[PDB]
């Protein structure tokens, strides 16, 4: 069950209240989020060791600046409340290896 956080501190909170956290920084006017969600769902039930959340850039622009988000869609995994890895382009297979690497 991918988690959607609508707060800036709540976003950062999720990052710090867990060892490893994976977030899909995305936009609502994009299609990949919808196309990447189906695979993301599978990843969420096996990779449950890793916490999955969703943070939009429009609701909390401050979040974008906090993580220096330049490209999109971007998938980043956070360790000890810090950025640990980045994945460009919402790809089921690409995230598969990225999510599997730290989560699997």
From Swiss-Prot:
Disulfide bonds join 30-33. Residues 2-104 form the Thioredoxin domain. One of its GO terms (molecular function) is protein-disulfide reductase activity. Pfam families: Thioredoxin (PF00085). One of its GO terms (cellular component) is cytosol. PANTHER family: THIOREDOXIN-LIKE PROTEIN 1. Belongs to the thioredoxin family. Participates in various redox reactions through the reversible oxidation of its active center dithiol to a disulfide and catalyzes dithiol-disulfide exchange reactions. By modifying the redox status of targeted proteins, induces changes in their structure and activity. Reduces oxidized glutathione (GSSG), thereby acting as a backup for the glutathione redox system. Reduces nitroglutathione (GSNO), a compound involved in the transport of nitric oxide (NO). Also reduces oxidative stress by detoxifying hydrogen peroxide, tert-butyl hydroperoxide and cumene hydroperoxide. This is Thioredoxin 1.
């Amino acid at each position: 069950s991918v988690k959607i956080v609508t707060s800036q501190s709540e976003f950062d909170s999720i990052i710090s209240q867990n060892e490893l956290v994976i977030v899909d920084f995305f936009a609502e006017w994009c299609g990949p989020c919808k196309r990447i969600a189906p695979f993301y769902e599978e990843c969420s039930k096996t990779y449950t060791k890793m916490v999955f959340i969703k943070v939009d850039v429009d609701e909390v622009s401050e979040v974008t600046e906090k993580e220096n988000i330049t490209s999109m869609p971007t998938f980043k995994v956070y360790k000890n409340g810090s950025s640990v890895d980045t994945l460009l382009g919402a790809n089921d297979s690409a995230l598969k290896q990225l999510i599997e690497k730290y989560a699997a």
